[PDB]
Ligand binder design. Structure first.
Ligand SMILES: Nc1nc2c(ncn2[C@@H]2O[C@H](COP(=O)(O)OP(=O)(O)OP(=O)(O)O)[C@@H](O)[C@H]2O)c(=O)[nH]1
Ligand SMILES: Nc1nc2c(ncn2[C@@H]2O[C@H](COP(=O)(O)OP(=O)(O)OP(=O)(O)O)[C@@H](O)[C@H]2O)c(=O)[nH]1
Ligand SMILES: COc1ccc(/N=N/c2cc(OC)c(OC)c(OC)c2)cc1O
Ligand SMILES: [Ca+2]
Ligand SMILES: [Mg+2]
Ligand SMILES: [Mg+2]
Lengths: 155, 426, 436
């Protein structure tokens, strides 16, 4: 099964292996036990080149795992700025909501990736989006006393 | 109650640790070769608390230096006080821990743990009356956090009747944006709640905020942050190092500052705040209680002081200090618990630190510290919910239940602070 | 002649001890090396000063005293100061690690490492006595050693010296010059455990002494040196009847007969006058009438409380100096025509009088001026219950939350001991309310 091998190649950053597996019929949209696809794993582990290769070969930029995480949620959480920009350029839903009510903006705010926050804001991220406990990204910056983040969200 | 055995673990632990030895050696009249060049007999009165007397009347720090990464040892020796350390007190492994708490605590760190304990035993048996231990470390990495807590538990099993005190550096994405740091810090807090008697919470978030918003350094470095840390460590150890009317030790501070066993996380503070290479009693009292002078990123006016200890250093009227301390408790009364009578203690030391005519050091056990714990907790939960990088930990022998248990303990800790913040003396 | 052994426990007991033995040496004419030229009986004697001082074959007068502390810093000063040669070197006992302001460490864990050495050294002092009357114990309420070690010591003295009197000089905590937040805990624990083992206890409220040093002596910020000098003057007036000839309180048994109507309410109030600053060397001399009146002013009391709010069960007036007995009689008669002196109906409304015709001595370097007449009044008034309630309230604020209790429990003490100690204090407050 080339799908299980493609999943492993995307996580480990094996560029030549991804190219080989796809040429041999590997499912670009294969999922693991929890619904993660090669694009989710490439975005999480910061393999920028694998993300672009997968997107030129029919990967669903808005695929969701069992917890509703899109590749954009995982890229915003981990702090991979180049990948966040590539995903938005390829149609990623900036305001996608996971099972916990979090959008990529909520995750970039919590983890303190301020550059990614500015990028999401510039691409239309909703400042009024509330999580399951009713908090917006602006509420998170007020509750944690993060003046740097509150300034950016007030722009 | 005399000698303290100091241990410094990992990169942050060794860097903050080296600056501490350099600063307190200067205050005590000691040079990098180990000789006493001081002018006041008050500099040698309690010198044995941190220094061993050696042949030729040489003063050797009772410090043990530990790291899984070997390169750290070279940076310690190349500093100004680098050759003052005992060449036999350096226990350095071959392979680091790459920000992995499990590497520090279970596999690479556990191999080098019996070696550190041999050095601890040697320094402890050579002590007339061992007070306890002092550990410097970060909670965000792998060695200082993972191996540091393992060392603490091991020492705790061998020397149960001694005090364990730590200077624990908390992570902030503002200084280091390494997404595994909330995991490492949460796992370590889970160990610190159980195994230490007193912990000084030194927050990199607060350190960055002071340098950027108050000191106007738009690009703060480790040197800049460590300048605030060394002044804090100098201030909080003043009474262990200088005679004074009080004969202060680690156990007397514990009995008086810690009303409930788990609530032993202190919020230190310093005034005046100054930058590298660059005041009256009423102003110094005010500054010492201002949220912008705290070393933990928490507003004290959001919580309540359970206990406070304050050290004013330099020449000044003790009556004026007594007057101003009582005055700050009158107007700011709603920020002190009324069920712990006389919970603010003050000491005056004649010897001030380097470059300052007067200074004040604040040590607060405040319910506002829950803000620091909630910040790390929210980050741990954001990561843990997506099981991001979990295999890097479980592959080293860790069970996923240890994460669940650490998160559960730290949230229980926040609930306990809230409980005493809302308690009334009725 | 019946001997008295003084025991000084912990820092407060030791420092107060040092200042008392200095003053005793000055009153009896004893030099810092122990020599006494006014003593014709060399190598022995049955004089009144012999109750507090033994003699060697070389004419050396040695204090019948034991100094104990769990750490050595405070006692080491005694070993090297002016009176270093006066005490028996083996009479000064020190451990290595103190009780860390914790009653449980002083009583249970650290205290047990030195209790037998202390008792064996006290036995060496007792064996040299012809007719030991008992012990004078000096200690703070607030320290770990003063509270816990003193309790363990008082328990063991009650088993080994069952028929002998035990009197305490206890330092009651003040917020102005205290060391620990848990001093109320240590204070209630030591009071409960010592209550049955002590026959009479004179409490010295550090806040009362601090106030007198500020008001009467014009001392801006009083140190322990200023407080201890005033305390030693008052302790000297209380013990003078034991060391000199006289007709009032001549032995330890008589302090109980005169001042303690019932075993549990054994806490007399001391009042002392006049207290004048040494900078007023040429002050006017106060009459017997003026100093006697001063004894009924709350400001001159050793324990902050209001005797107008309570009833008297006993009143003793100890004069020192140029004091004519008929002038004392006239001053008392004037004082009796006053509504603030209410005795309990079951006690005679009398005032016992003792006069020592030597003026008080002042120590060189002290704060007090010399006076031609002084008076110390010792009275058992139910108004001292106010001191107990202030301490019990502080105990209650903390104990309701169980704040600091784990430190005690971690040193071999059961949590049940705190409630048993508090219940005893509740009973003690009711004992004062039942008297009136
Ligand atoms: N204030 C301060 N923080 C530091 C310093 N060095 C590192 N840190 C912080 O410490 C954390 C990283 O831990 P380190 O001490 O570098 O790691 P370690 O304990 O050596 O562990 P490994 O290298 O992962 O085996 C991050 O939060 C850093 O920001 C320093 O000198 N000062
Ligand atoms: N008047 C007076 N009070 C004193 C003196 N020294 C200490 N105190 C009081 O005694 C209490 C503290 O007890 P200490 O006697 O110092 O303690 P300790 O008995 O040595 O016990 P540990 O040090 O806990 O082992 C506080 O209330 C102090 O204010 C002194 O010389 N004079
Ligand atoms: C709130 O009440 C209390 C608090 C602490 C007390 N003393 N413990 C110490 C205090 C210190 O600074 C003044 C100190 O310097 C840091 C220290 O060095 C070891 C001990 C006593 C108290 O009554
Ligand atoms: Ca004789
Ligand atoms: Mg490192
Ligand atoms: Mg002591």
């Amino acid at each position: 099964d080339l799908g299980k091998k493609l999943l492993e190649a995307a996580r480990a950053g094996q560029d030549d292996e991804v190219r080989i597996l796809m040429a041999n019929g590997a499912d670009v949209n294969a999922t693991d036990a929890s619904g993660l696809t090669p694009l989710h794993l490439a975005a999480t582990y910061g393999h920028l080149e694998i993300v672009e290769v997968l997107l030129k070969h029919g990967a669903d930029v808005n695929a969701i795992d069992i917890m509703g995480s899109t590749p954009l949620h995982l890229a915003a959480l981990i702090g991979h700025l180049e990948i966040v920009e590539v995903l938005l350029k390829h149609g990623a839903d900036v305001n996608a909501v996971d099972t916990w009510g979090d959008t990529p903006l909520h995750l970039a705010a919590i983890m303190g990736h301020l550059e990614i926050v500015e990028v999401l804001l510039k691409h239309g991220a909703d400042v009024n989006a509330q999580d399951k406990f009713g908090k917006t990204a602006f509420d998170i910056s007020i509750d944690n006393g993060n003046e740097d983040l509150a300034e950016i969200l007030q722009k | 109650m005399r000698e303290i055995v100091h241990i410094q673990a990992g990169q942050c632990g060794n860097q903050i640790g080296a600056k501490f030895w350099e600063v307190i050696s200067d205050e005590h009249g000691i040079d990098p070769t180990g000789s006493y060049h001081g002018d006041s007999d008050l500099q040698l009165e309690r010198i044995n608390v941190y220094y061993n007397e050696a042949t030729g009347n040489k003063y050797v720090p009772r410090a043990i230096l530990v790291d899984l990464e070997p390169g750290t040892m070279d940076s310690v020796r190349s500093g100004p006080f680098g050759q003052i350390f005992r060449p036999d007190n350096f226990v350095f492994g071959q392979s680091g821990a790459g920000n992995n708490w499990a590497k520090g605590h279970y596999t690479e760190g556990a191999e080098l743990v019996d070696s550190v304990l041999d050095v601890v035993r040697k320094e402890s048996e050579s002590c007339d009356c061992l007070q306890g231990f002092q550990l410097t470390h970060s909670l965000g990495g792998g060695t200082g956090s993972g191996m540091g807590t393992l060392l603490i538990s091991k020492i705790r099993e061998e020397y149960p009747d001694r005090i364990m005190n730590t200077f624990s550096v908390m992570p902030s994405p503002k200084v280091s944006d390494t997404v595994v740091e909330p995991y490492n810090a949460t796992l370590s807090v889970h160990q610190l709640v159980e195994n230490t008697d007193e912990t000084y919470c030194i927050d990199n978030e607060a350190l960055y905020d002071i340098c950027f918003r108050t000191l106007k350094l738009t690009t703060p470095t480790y040197g800049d942050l460590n300048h605030l840390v060394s002044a804090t460590m100098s201030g909080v150890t003043t009474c262990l190092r200088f005679p004074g009317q009080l004969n202060a030790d680690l156990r007397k501070l514990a009995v008086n500052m810690v009303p409930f066993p788990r609530l032993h996380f202190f919020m230190p503070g310093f005034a005046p705040l100054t930058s590298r290479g660059s005041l009256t009693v009423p102003e110094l009292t005010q500054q010492m209680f201002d949220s912008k002078n705290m070393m933990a990123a928490c507003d004290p006016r959001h919580g309540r002081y359970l206990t406070v200890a304050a050290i004013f250093r330099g020449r000044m009227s003790m009556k004026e200090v007594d007057e101003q301390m009582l005055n700050v408790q009158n107007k700011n009364s709603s920020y002190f618990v009324e069920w712990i009578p006389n919970n603010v203690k003050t000491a005056v030391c004649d010897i001030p630190p380097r470059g300052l005519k007067m200074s004040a050091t604040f040590i607060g056990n405040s319910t506002a510290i829950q803000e620091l714990f909630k910040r790390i907790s929210e980050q741990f939960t954001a990561m843990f919910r997506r099981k991001a990088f979990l295999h890097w930990y479980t592959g080293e022998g860790m069970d996923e239940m240890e994460f669940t248990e650490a998160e559960s303990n730290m949230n229980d800790l926040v609930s306990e602070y809230q409980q005493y913040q809302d308690a009334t003396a009725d | 002649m019946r001997e008295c052994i003084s025991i000084h426990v912990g820092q407060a007991g030791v420092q107060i001890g040092n200042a008392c033995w200095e003053l005793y040496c000055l009153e009896h004419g004893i030099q810092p090396d122990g020599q006494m030229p006014s003593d014709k009986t060399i190598g022995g004697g049955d004089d009144s000063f012999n109750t507090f001082f033994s003699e060697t074959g070389a004419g050396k007068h040695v204090p019948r005293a034991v100094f104990v502390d769990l750490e050595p810093t405070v006692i080491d000063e005694v070993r090297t100061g002016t009176y270093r040669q006066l005490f028996h070197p083996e009479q000064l006992i020190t451990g290595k690690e103190d009780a860390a302001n914790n009653y449980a460490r002083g009583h249970y864990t650290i205290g047990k490492e030195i209790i037998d050495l202390v008792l064996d050294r006290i036995r060496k002092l007792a064996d040299q006595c012809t007719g030991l009357q008992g012990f004078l114990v000096f200690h703070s309420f607030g320290g770990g050693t003063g509270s816990g070690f003193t309790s363990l010591l008082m328990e063991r003295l009650s088993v080994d010296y069952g028929k002998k009197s035990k009197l305490e000089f206890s330092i009651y905590p003040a917020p102005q010059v205290s060391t620990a937040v848990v001093e109320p805990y240590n204070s209630i624990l030591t009071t409960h455990t010592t209550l049955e083992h002590s026959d009479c206890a004179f409490m010295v409220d550090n806040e009362a002494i601090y106030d007198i040093c500020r008001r009467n002596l014009d001392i801006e910020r009083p140190t322990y040196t200023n407080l201890n000098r005033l305390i030693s003057q008052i302790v000297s007036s209380i013990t003078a009847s034991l060391r000199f000839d006289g007709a009032l309180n001549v032995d330890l048994t008589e302090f109980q007969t005169n001042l303690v109507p019932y075993p549990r309410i054994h806490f007399p109030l001391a009042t002392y006058a006049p207290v004048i600053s040494a900078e007023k060397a040429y002050h006017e001399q106060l009459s017997v009438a003026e100093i006697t009146n001063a004894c009924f002013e709350p400001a001159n009391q050793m324990v902050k409380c209001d005797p107008r709010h309570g009833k008297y069960m006993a009143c003793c007036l100890l004069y020192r100096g140029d004091v004519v007995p008929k002038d004392v009689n006239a001053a008392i008669a004037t004082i009796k025509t006053k509504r603030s002196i209410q005795f309990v109906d079951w006690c005679p409304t009398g005032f016992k009088v003792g006069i020592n015709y030597q003026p008080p001595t002042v120590v060189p370097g002290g704060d007090l001026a010399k006076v031609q007449r002084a008076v110390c009044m010792l009275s058992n008034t139910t108004a001292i219950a106010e001191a107990w309630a202030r301490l019990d309230h502080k105990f209650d604020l903390m104990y309701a939350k169980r704040a600091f209790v784990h430190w005690y429990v971690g040193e071999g003490m059961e949590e049940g001991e705190f409630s048993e100690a508090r219940e005893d204090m509740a009973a003690l407050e009711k004992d004062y309310e039942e008297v009136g």
